[PDB]
Amino acid sequence: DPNAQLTTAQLQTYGDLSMMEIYRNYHYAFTQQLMGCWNTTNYGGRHTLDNNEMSRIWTSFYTQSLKNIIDAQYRTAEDAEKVNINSVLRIYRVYLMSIITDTYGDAPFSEAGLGFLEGKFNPKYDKQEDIYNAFFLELEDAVNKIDPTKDKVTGDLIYAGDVTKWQQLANSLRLRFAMRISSVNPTKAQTEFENALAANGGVITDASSDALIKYMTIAFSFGQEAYSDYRGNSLSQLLFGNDPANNPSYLCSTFFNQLYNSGDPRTFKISRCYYDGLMSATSPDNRVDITQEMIEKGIAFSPRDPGAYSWEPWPTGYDSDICAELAVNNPSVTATMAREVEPKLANNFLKSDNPGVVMTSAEVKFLMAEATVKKWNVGSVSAEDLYKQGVRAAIDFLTDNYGCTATTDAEFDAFIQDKGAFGHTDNQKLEAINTQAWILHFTNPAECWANVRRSGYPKLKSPAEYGFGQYLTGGTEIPVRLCYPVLESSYNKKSYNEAIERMGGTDNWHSLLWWDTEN
Ligand SMILES: OC[C@H]1O[C@@H](O[C@H]2[C@H](O)[C@@H](O)[C@H](O[C@H]3[C@H](O)[C@@H](O)[C@H](O[C@@H]4[C@@H](O)[C@H](O[C@H]5[C@H](O)[C@@H](O)[C@H](O[C@H]6[C@H](O)[C@@H](O)[C@H](O[C@@H]7[C@@H](O)[C@H](O)O[C@H](CO)[C@H]7O)O[C@@H]6CO)O[C@@H]5CO)O[C@H](CO)[C@H]4O)O[C@@H]3CO)O[C@@H]2CO)[C@H](O)[C@@H](O)[C@@H]1O
Ligand SMILES: [Mg+2]
Numbered sequence: 001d002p003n004a005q006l007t008t009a010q011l012q013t014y015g016d017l018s019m020m021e022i023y024r025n026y027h028y029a030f031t032q033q034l035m036g037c038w039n040t041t042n043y044g045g046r047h048t049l050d051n052n053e054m055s056r057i058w059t060s061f062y063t064q065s066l067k068n069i070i071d072a073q074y075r076t077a078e079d080a081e082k083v084n085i086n087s088v089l090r091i092y093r094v095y096l097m098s099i100i101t102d103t104y105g106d107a108p109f110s111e112a113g114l115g116f117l118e119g120k121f122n123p124k125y126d127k128q129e130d131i132y133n134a135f136f137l138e139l140e141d142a143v144n145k146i147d148p149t150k151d152k153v154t155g156d157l158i159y160a161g162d163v164t165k166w167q168q169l170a171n172s173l174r175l176r177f178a179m180r181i182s183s184v185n186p187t188k189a190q191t192e193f194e195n196a197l198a199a200n201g202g203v204i205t206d207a208s209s210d211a212l213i214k215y216m217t218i219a220f221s222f223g224q225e226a227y228s229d230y231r232g233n234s235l236s237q238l239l240f241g242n243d244p245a246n247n248p249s250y251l252c253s254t255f256f257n258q259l260y261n262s263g264d265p266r267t268f269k270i271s272r273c274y275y276d277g278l279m280s281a282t283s284p285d286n287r288v289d290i291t292q293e294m295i296e297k298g299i300a301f302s303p304r305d306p307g308a309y310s311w312e313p314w315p316t317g318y319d320s321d322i323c324a325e326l327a328v329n330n331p332s333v334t335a336t337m338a339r340e341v342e343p344k345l346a347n348n349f350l351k352s353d354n355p356g357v358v359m360t361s362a363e364v365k366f367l368m369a370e371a372t373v374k375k376w377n378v379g380s381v382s383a384e385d386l387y388k389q390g391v392r393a394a395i396d397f398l399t400d401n402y403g404c405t406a407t408t409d410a411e412f413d414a415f416i417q418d419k420g421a422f423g424h425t426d427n428q429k430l431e432a433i434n435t436q437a438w439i440l441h442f443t444n445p446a447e448c449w450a451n452v453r454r455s456g457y458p459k460l461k462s463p464a465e466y467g468f469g470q471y472l473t474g475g476t477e478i479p480v481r482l483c484y485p486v487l488e489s490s491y492n493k494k495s496y497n498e499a500i501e502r503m504g505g506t507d508n509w510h511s512l513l514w515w516d517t518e519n
Pocket of ligand 2: 452453454455456516517518519
């Protein structure tokens with residue numbers, strides 16, 4: 001059933017426990033948002049190339065999510081009484097394919113998943129440039145073929161079948177991809193962006209049309225059954241951890257310092273310092289929050305520089321009154337804190353029912369701001385006002401979707417009028433926009449990495465510059481793509497050879513993707 005296929009594809013987006021490892025291992029290190037967890041530091045933190053780890057997106061999407069949606073799109077393409085489910089499938093196929101190409105570059109798309117349908121195996125790799133062409137034509141046509149008088153969409157965990165919102169999402173995705181190609185093809189970028197604003201339905205203009213995959217409140221399990229269970233947010237499960245006491249989600253200094261040093265209200269909504277001596281083995285219950293105690297006693301937060309483990313360098317701790325008091329009736333507790341002074345990801349982001357973020361109004365505000373700085377014709381609102389509106393929506397996103405404490409007007413105004421302020425020069429504005437997007441995209445690591453590479457903001461430095469150069473087996477520079485699966489070079493040989501021929505025979509994670517014009 002086409003509608004059922006949509007449900008599963010959507011669940012499989014953040015629900016696949018197997019695939020979400022790639023984000024913990026590589027992405028969150030490359031974006032320098034998490035660091036210290038063994039998996040994050042070893043792989044992305046110290047540029048350890050592992051083909052199995054790098055091919056998780058490819059394998060997962062081409063064997064499950066995208067394969068299914070391609071099949072469902074195909075069976076509904078020629079049926080005028082199924083134009084809504086068809087259009088929706090086409091929009092989601094674009095979204096899922098965007099994650100593939102923004103990871104690896106050239107990939108099967110046009111010929112993808114046509115094994116049993118057309119008897120066409122060994123699909124060719126479409127050029128990234130052509131994939132992006134296809135994204136604009138597919139989203140434009142999907143938007144124009146939507147018709148609320150036709151079929152009802154019954155399996156949709158994002159908008160519950162509201163096809164008007166799917167129009168808004170499609171046109172917002174056009175905005176995203178327009179701005180992605182804004183360095184490599186400036187004129188096309190501008191046209192596509194302007195066309196998207198003018199299209200039927202418009203774009204996502206406030207949070208009520210944010211594209212969030214709803215996930216279920218379900219227990220974290222790492223047993224075998226869990227790897228075919230997509231009902232819960234598996235990225236959140238992983239950031240809690242298979243090894244949650246030894247290897248939780250410690251924040252990277254780049255991200256923590258950005259928040260802390262800018263007086264960002266979200267510093268201690270996103271991160272806290274926890275003692276986990278009594279923490280549950282399979283959920284983030286019974287953690288001792290020591291953040292306020294550390295501030296009162298004047299204890300230095302010690303976030304992990306890129307390349308550092310939680311244990312290297314070993315931090316300076318203190319003796320906790322809170323933990324000493326808790327030790328009286330809980331004798332297993334110790335009062336001496338060590339790695340607890342290293343900020344960790346807040347409990348709010350460690351829930352199975354955390355949404356799977358596809359795209360937000362906050363991002364749209366930022367794309368619009370950047371468009372206005374580039375002097376595109378995108379309306380009457382000032383860049384600054386758009387920027388201000390995006391930062392606000394990005395702060396409020398945490399309140400509305402993760403039950404974080406509300407940020408007051410006065411708190412927001414203090415931040416935005418000081419170190420959160422918009423730039424004056426073009427470069428300062430682009431920096432501010434894309435640094436702020438960086439923070440927003442923390443729960444959308446696919447998009448977070450794509451935009452850091454594309455925008456060049458924030459300016460990140462190699463782990464080498466933090467004293468970890470001796471461990472970098474895969475080279476100095478932060479990888480800007482992932483290499484193709486060995487499976488592909490083995491069993492899709494002709495198509496693979498054709499693809500690597502276009503990169504001078506290389507298949508290297510330091511080769512810039514077509515939309516990424518500089519390191
Ligand atoms: O000096 C002053 C003070 O010192 C104090 O002592 C300190 C000391 O100073 C420190 O140096 C020391 O540091 C220790 C630290 O305590 C240890 O925790 C650390 O241990 C790491 C260890 O975590 C790590 O383990 C990982 C394994 O290596 C991996 O193989 C394993 O991989 C997992 C993976 O995590 C998981 O995701 C994966 O899932 C599979 C999926 O991929 C697949 O798709 O599906 C299948 C099922 O279908 C899944 O299984 O599975 C794999 C398993 O195959 O992850 C492990 C982590 O989760 O290994 C590292 C090296 O191998 C270890 O180092 O080591 C540090 C040292 O290096 O700590 C002490 C304190 O104890 C003094 O006490 C003070 O007095 C002094 O003042
Ligand atoms: Mg770049």
